[PDB]
Ligand binder design. Structure first.
Ligand SMILES: *[C@@H]1O[C@H](CO)[C@@H](O[C@@H]2O[C@H](CO)[C@@H](O)[C@H](O)[C@H]2NC(C)=O)[C@H](O)[C@H]1NC(C)=O
Ligand SMILES: CC(=O)N[C@@H]1[C@@H](O)[C@H](O)[C@@H](CO)O[C@H]1O
Ligand SMILES: CC(=O)N[C@@H]1[C@@H](O)[C@H](O)[C@@H](CO)O[C@H]1O
Ligand SMILES: CC(=O)N[C@@H]1[C@@H](O)[C@H](O)[C@@H](CO)O[C@H]1O
Ligand SMILES: CC(=O)N[C@@H]1[C@@H](O)[C@H](O)[C@@H](CO)O[C@H]1O
Ligand SMILES: CC(=O)N[C@@H]1[C@@H](O)[C@H](O)[C@@H](CO)O[C@H]1O
Ligand SMILES: OC[C@H]1O[C@@H](O)[C@@H](O)[C@@H](O)[C@@H]1O
Ligand SMILES: OC[C@H]1O[C@@H](O)[C@@H](O)[C@@H](O)[C@@H]1O
Ligand SMILES: OC[C@H]1O[C@H](O)[C@@H](O)[C@@H](O)[C@@H]1O
Ligand SMILES: OC[C@H]1O[C@H](O)[C@@H](O)[C@@H](O)[C@@H]1O
Ligand SMILES: [O-][O-]
Ligand SMILES: [Cu+2]
Ligand SMILES: [Cu+2]
Ligand SMILES: [Cu+2]
Length: 554
């Protein structure tokens, strides 16, 4: 009880192994989420959105390390199912609460509910979002903020800072055109924590920029989350240094930088000290042009307003000269050093490789992303956990199910995700923080690659980097994780369009121990409701063909 005195995690600290030890708080944080169909004018232009409780971003789930969180999700829409995923939450022996349509549950139909219950067995910053088709990017997402230890001190916690791309047509409206094109999706603008201005065709300014206020001398924590559909950002604040203290849910040895490159699904916790002359400073979220197509890359900005700065007055500050805003990169392996030091014990690991390609299918054609040789093609109404309940020793996986088996308790898997294309992708794994062993450009060399096993970066989302066409294209990333968590775990590109097109596989982990978590009633109650919806509403039927809005299932 000498550690972290007068905190909810008294008896534990920054050195506690949070994979093995959790504070007991006895506390349950209970949330009620209505998923609603509405409109909003987040940058001053009205359009349809799907929201949690009428808010964008959705309300923050806030808890202390070791709490239990209970989220009652009710579907108040007409024409979508829903499922809510808690990104980066380990869900240890709790796979059926992971919120993945077609894996861990059927979708929740309109007028039905699902109660997610999970343990805060990590601390730091993340987010929840729909894991049903493109719905997260219609606005169904919000923060997860779990208080706990930190690797540097500060005075004020500003909470979540979401980074989003945005357009005035919806992602669902765009989807058919995306499917039928070899060009990446184009977005018109972006939002910082759900706000921006917009310049109209007649040069009027509508909307309002994100703004935050600093007291000179004070230190502020910002919890950055990239929730964009198809944009890799560099975040910066003119004239201010940023001290990075965590990557995803893993506290790291702090380091200071002038910008944070942040991929879709990733989080970084930063501390900013108000040590500049009192003034207004631009906060910038800049799409990286190699892998983002945005009409307004230089106008996704907010305002840092010091007390002492002019009111009603935009910044005139200059961007940090950190180089170009072209490549889509992570912090390097040597920059991200987990504070809790753990080695990747990959002796005796199972080795796998999943290639990434983009291929035409059918007569239109539709251009689909494939991972490990197949575009994922699975079933909302027949989720993987139903298949294994019906047949506990099932071995007859279809190619289109994209299965990677990890049957042996605690045995490591080393997975190489590779591509020949000049296109990078943020790779996210459910149910695990993976160990990031390598990340590179060009061809993967099985002889020459060095794997970092000595306290490598550890997180839940990392880029498969790729070279530009002039440098030959292609790239790879290599991850390691032990089979410490029975369940069916999605591994996929965190670009929504890509995952829905097929860029996803499923890790079937310790299949013989699904009894540790599985509830037939929790599965079938929702599946039965979903079937009743599908009878009366065409949106209840999954489009799985090649002349319409193909849905991979996730
Ligand atoms: C970004 O938007 C979120 C969601 O509205 C804001 O969340 C608040 O965060 C603070 C600090 O953790 C909490 O006190 C509030 O309860 C949250 N409100 C919610 C979730 O409705 C967040 O403050 C915004 N970020 C900034 C920097 O303004
Ligand atoms: C997910 C969902 O329910 N979306 C619906 C949409 O289908 C309908 O066109 C609109 C107008 O009624 O309301 C909203
Ligand atoms: C504004 C809008 O999108 N409205 C659509 C409507 O045209 C359609 O008939 C209905 C069912 O698909 O969904 C809603
Ligand atoms: C409109 C509709 O069909 N809804 C029915 C309603 O009678 C019931 O009260 C509710 C809660 O179970 O869900 C069901
Ligand atoms: C669930 C589903 O769509 N089943 C299809 C069937 O309709 C189709 O005739 C066949 C050949 O393409 O492949 C399978
Ligand atoms: C793109 C593709 O291969 N789609 C197939 C579809 O033809 C088939 O009907 C279905 C069977 O469940 O699986 C999927
Ligand atoms: O109210 C929920 C939480 O929101 C945030 C801060 O404002 C805290 O003071 C508060 O506990
Ligand atoms: O409206 C944008 C798109 O929406 C969806 C389908 O209705 C398509 O036919 C259409 O092109
Ligand atoms: O491209 C025009 C397109 O706009 C949007 C919808 O109103 C569609 O019905 C229409 O086809
Ligand atoms: O392909 C789905 C849908 O896309 C758009 C239009 O071309 C429609 O006529 C068509 O039905
Ligand atoms: O995050 O999926
Ligand atoms: Cu996830
Ligand atoms: Cu992708
Ligand atoms: Cu996911």
């Amino acid at each position: 009880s000498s550690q972290s005195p007068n905190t909810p995690w008294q008896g534990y600290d920054i050195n506690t192994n949070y994979y093995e030890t959790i504070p007991q708080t006895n506390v349950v944080r209970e949330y009620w989420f209505d998923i609603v169909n509405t409109t909003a004018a987040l940058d001053g232009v009205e359009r349809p959105v799907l929201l949690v409780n009428g808010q964008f971003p959705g309300p923050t789930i806030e808890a202390n390390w070791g709490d239990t969180v209970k989220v009652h999700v009710t579907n108040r829409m007409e024409n979508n199912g829903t499922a809510i995923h808690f990104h980066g939450i380990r869900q240890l022996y709790n796979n059926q609460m992971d919120g993945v349509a077609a894996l861990t549950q059927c979708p929740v139909p309109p007028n039905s509910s699902y109660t997610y219950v999970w343990r805060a067995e990590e601390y730091g910053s993340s987010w929840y979002h729909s894991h049903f088709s493109l719905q997260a990017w219609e606005g169904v997402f919000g923060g997860i903020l779990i208080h706990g230890p930190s690797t540097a001190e500060y005075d004020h916690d500003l909470g979540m800072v979401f980074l989003n791309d945005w357009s005035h047509q919806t992602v669902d409206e765009m989807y058919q055109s995306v499917l039928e094109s070899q060009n990446p999706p184009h977005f018109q603008t972006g939002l910082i924590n759900g706000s921006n201005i917009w310049v109209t065709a007649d040069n009027q300014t509508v909307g309002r920029r994100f703004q935050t206020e600093f007291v000179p001398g004070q230190r502020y924590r910002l919890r950055l989350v990239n929730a964009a559909m198809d944009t890799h950002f560099r975040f910066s604040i003119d004239n201010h240094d940023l001290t990075v203290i965590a990557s995803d849910f893993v506290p790291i040895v702090p380091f200071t930088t002038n910008n944070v490159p942040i991929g879709m699904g990733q989080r970084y916790d930063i501390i900013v000290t108000a040590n500049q002359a009192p003034d207004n400073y631009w906060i910038r979220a800049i799409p990286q042009s190699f892998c983002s197509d945005n009409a307004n890359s230089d106008n996704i900005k907010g305002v840092l307003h010091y007390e002492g700065a002019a009111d009603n007055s935009d910044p005139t500050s200059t961007k940090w000269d950190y180089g170009d805003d072209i490549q889509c990169l992570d912090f390097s392996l040597d920059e991200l050093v987990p504070w809790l030091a753990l080695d990747a014990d990959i002796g005796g690991a199972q080795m796998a490789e999943s290639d990434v390609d983009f291929t035409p299918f059918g007569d239109v054609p539709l251009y689909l992303w494939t991972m490990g040789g197949n575009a994922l093609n699975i079933s909302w109404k027949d989720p993987t956990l139903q298949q294994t309940f019906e047949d506990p020793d099932k071995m007859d996986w279809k190619a289109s199910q994209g299965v990677i088996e990890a049957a042996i308790p605690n045995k490591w898997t080393v997975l190489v995700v590779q591509t020949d294309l000049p296109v990078p992708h943020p790779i996210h794994l459910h149910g695990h923080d993976f160990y990031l062993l390598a990340q590179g450009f060009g061809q993967f060399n099985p002889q020459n690659v060095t794997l970092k096993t000595h306290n490598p970066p550890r997180r839940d989302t990392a880029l498969m980097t790729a070279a530009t066409p002039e440098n030959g294209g292609g790239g790879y990333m290599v991850i390691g994780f032990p089979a410490d968590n029975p369940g069916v775990w999605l591994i996929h590109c965190h670009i929504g369009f890509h995952a829905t097109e097929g860029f996803a596989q499923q890790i079937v982990e310790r299949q013989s121990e699904f009894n540790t978590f599985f509830s037939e009633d929790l599965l079938e109650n929702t599946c039965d409701a979903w079937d009743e919806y599908a009878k009366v509403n065409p949106y209840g039927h999954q489009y799985r063909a090649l002349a319409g809005p193909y849905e991979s299932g996730i």
